[PDB]
Ligand binder design. Structure first.
Ligand SMILES: Cc1ncc(COP(=O)(O)O)c(CNOCC[S@@+](C)C[C@H]2O[C@@H](n3cnc4c(N)ncnc43)[C@H](O)[C@@H]2O)c1O
Ligand SMILES: Cc1ncc(COP(=O)(O)O)c(CNOCC[S@@+](C)C[C@H]2O[C@@H](n3cnc4c(N)ncnc43)[C@H](O)[C@@H]2O)c1O
Lengths: 421, 421
């Protein structure tokens, strides 16, 4: 077989003994799965009121044959139009997207890998701010032969990207004899739970301009920014500057999007690539061939997203319920004397548990982590799994479980800190 | 951008002037698109009688949230079970498939590339019998860095694979300094329209055993074998031999399947990988992450395929209508004094038009091809596009257009041969 052919304790323990309000009340509570189960009722109500799309019907007529045959990698026109409209709405209509520059893919997972395939050759690299979504270690490197060089961020400044961290990253790549092709960021951030600052964005654009490299912004959480400071898409910063089709960096700024986190439809595999570079769009379009979005799904979501009443109310309501749940987690944690990095987006909080470590080491972090799993029966993510340089931080999700289960988790954790500390 | 980032006349002319019974009767008739539009009515009737699956309902209950959240790359259990049952039924239940060894992918396009990623490293190669599906030149090589070495087949023996052709292929690879990792075949064959013979299969199994390489059988057309000789899956040949988990080749024989051609649902992107090798299944499962099948689609098709009455009648009816349409094309061609390679499967015929060429050259072939496009307003595929070693053969599809349009095409072609020959 080829070479390609050849932190899990929390989950393996979870599957063996999963928590359930009635069938297993002693099970481990899931707080490490970043999924949104807060607004399904809004989608179910829409589906009940508008049954035709899911029924393969349009204006009373059957379009099953037409959809069954639609396999064009340019994507369904009506669906791409609805998607760009939705992406603009998410950004307060401060930026518009050309549907001809959008490429549909089977989830952001597919989109990110495709971008790497189009922008870097095997042996080259991309810079990524730490901590970062651990899925990237496989998604971005596995079949691409591309390497990841970290741009270290620390708690000192709220885990923000600095000019010095970027140069040190660029320097590490050189020392490893790796040619840098770009920087990939997550905005809003997983696992930080914060929106990138305008300052960081200009800092990034200036850096990629100087180095003549690419900037890929994974904005899958763009619709989940529920509190100040405001979410700023990388595309917005380009407009209000000489980069507005008056520079070169404009062609090297790209966005990745998905319906997995805001709408909570990860199973449907709706991802999107957006680029101003005509050649990247052409290349990605052909690559999408290996991971197209089901035409049945494309039709359903074009109908849903074309409804301006649904999109408007969904975003507002999603923001409301997410904010409510995040505050509940923050308040719950405070009662145990546990603080969080001040966040305003995502489906999780970046929790500070440094003062609960035996010592300032990752060995201590894994120790604490295992205690929470076996003693507290809570599954969360140790920061080292996200490549955070300082031991003690944890990602704790809050949008996948019922409010009452969240409270249960908090009181068990409180019982824990009072018992061992 | 990376390197990856950087025969069409018939289609470009088609899009500019596409044929239509009422809106453009002088348009070019499409006979180069291998799609099945013969049995949509059977699927529409089932959907009308069983509306719950498409409605996200099971036993009267809504399962929208559950499906929306299902993103596991091991695939929906009920759907994989229905798929293996269907694959066995297609093969007359002569072979059974373990659902734990099946991996769902976004179409066979995705499945084939993934198999290449798991079996060969960049710089290595796979042998493929010519003529072959031109999509392979991009699908199998583009992002994999793998090369294709042809196993030449000629009309002398009905375009069958011979021991000598295999060794000559294996020899060409060596001369090009390429290490061979396996052979990929299409059974039934696109564009031949023939089922592989038991003789060819044993010949292939013996060859891959000797060379210690893999055998990948793309059986996407397995359900479209409508006439004798019988279709024989590569998996069947393994059973009735010492290869029945009593050898080594057993672990190196793999199958690719899809619902794009038999059921005519290419837009839904339902592909499948099947392998006896535990490691290949594990690897492919993780790779499917880049191209998963929409859970909405998985649910719908698990319901459809779980209905034994539908699957039985669909296969029988598909066989009937396909056979009827193929005979019509064969008879239509005979009237113009044009013969076809005796075939029994697929959605197309491999047509012999050598006697209509100015000379025995590919330049002559392209000449004739362009005449049929501009003079006859018919779009078919020149054999050279499929890498056929002898000029003059063409692939002509018959399952995508109405019977009357097919006849129209035949009479225009007859008018052509009588006018220039
Ligand atoms: C910043 C960021 N970007 C993109 C994504 C992916 O979202 P899409 O749904 O649009 O692709 C995420 C979040 N991803 O969360 C879910 C991870 S799955 C989609 C992909 C990922 O997970 C690994 N994995 C492990 N076990 C898996 C099972 N059982 N099924 C599927 N995937 C599974 C994969 O190997 C892969 O790396 C995000 O935060
Ligand atoms: C033997 C054989 N195996 C597999 C397949 C693929 O079937 P799936 O639908 O299960 O993936 C086929 C037949 N494929 O026929 C359709 C070709 S598409 C699925 C993929 C293929 O076509 C190229 N292409 C060119 N223009 C395209 C547009 N506009 N949309 C999609 N694909 C398009 C791609 O670059 C790719 O190589 C078969 O015979």
């Amino acid at each position: 077989l080829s070479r390609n052919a050849t932190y899990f304790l929390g989950w393996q323990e979870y599957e063996k003994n999963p928590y359930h309000e009635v069938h297993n009340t002693n099970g481990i509570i899931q707080m490490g799965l970043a999924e949104n189960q807060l607004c399904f009722d809004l989608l179910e109500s829409w589906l009940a009121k508008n049954p035709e799309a899911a029924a393969f019907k349009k204006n009373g007529e059957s379009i099953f044959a037409e959809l069954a045959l639609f396999q064009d990698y340019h994507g369904l026109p009506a669906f791409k139009k609805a998607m760009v409209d939705f992406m603009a709405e998410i950004r307060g209509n401060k930026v518009t997207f050309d549907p001809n520059h959008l490429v549909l893919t089977a989830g952001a997972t597919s989109a990110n890998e495709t971008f790497i395939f189009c922008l870097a050759d095997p042996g080259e690299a991309v810079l990524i701010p730490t901590p970062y979504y651990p899925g990237f270690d496989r998604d971005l490197k596995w079949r691409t032969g591309v390497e990841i060089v970290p741009i270290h961020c620390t708690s000192s400044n709220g885990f923000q990207i600095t000019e010095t961290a970027l140069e040190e990253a660029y320097q590490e790549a050189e020392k490893r004899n790796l040619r840098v092709k770009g920087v990939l960021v997550t905005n809003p951030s997983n696992p930080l739970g914060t929106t990138m600052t305008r300052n960081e964005l200009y800092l990034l654009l200036s850096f990629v301009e100087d180095k003549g490299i690419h900037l890929i912004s994974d904005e899958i959480y763009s619709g989940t920014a529920f509190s100040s400071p405001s979410f700023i898409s990388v595309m917005e910063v380009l407009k209000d500057r000489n980069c507005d089709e008056n520079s070169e960096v404009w062609q090297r700024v790209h966005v990745v999007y998905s319906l997995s986190k805001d709408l909570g439809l990860p199973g449907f595999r709706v991802g999107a690539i957006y680029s101003n570079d005509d050649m990247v769009v052409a290349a990605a379009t052909k690559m999408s061939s290996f991971g197209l979005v089901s035409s049945q799904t494309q039709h359903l979501l074009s109908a849903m997203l074309s409804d301006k009443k649904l999109t408007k109310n969904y975003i507002a309501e999603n923001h409301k319920r997410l904010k409510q749940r995040q505050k509940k987690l923050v308040s719950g944690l405070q009662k145990s004397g546990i603080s969080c990095l001040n966040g305003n987006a995502g489906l999780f909080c970046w929790v500070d548990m440094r003062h609960l470590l035996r010592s300032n080491t990752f060995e201590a972090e894994m120790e604490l982590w295992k205690k929470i799993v076996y003693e507290v029966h809570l599954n969360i993510s140790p920061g080292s799994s996200c490549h955070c340089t300082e031991p003690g931080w944890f990602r704790v999700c809050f949008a996948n479980l019922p409010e009452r289960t969240l409270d249960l988790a908090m009181q068990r954790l409180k019982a824990f800190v009072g018992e061992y500390y």
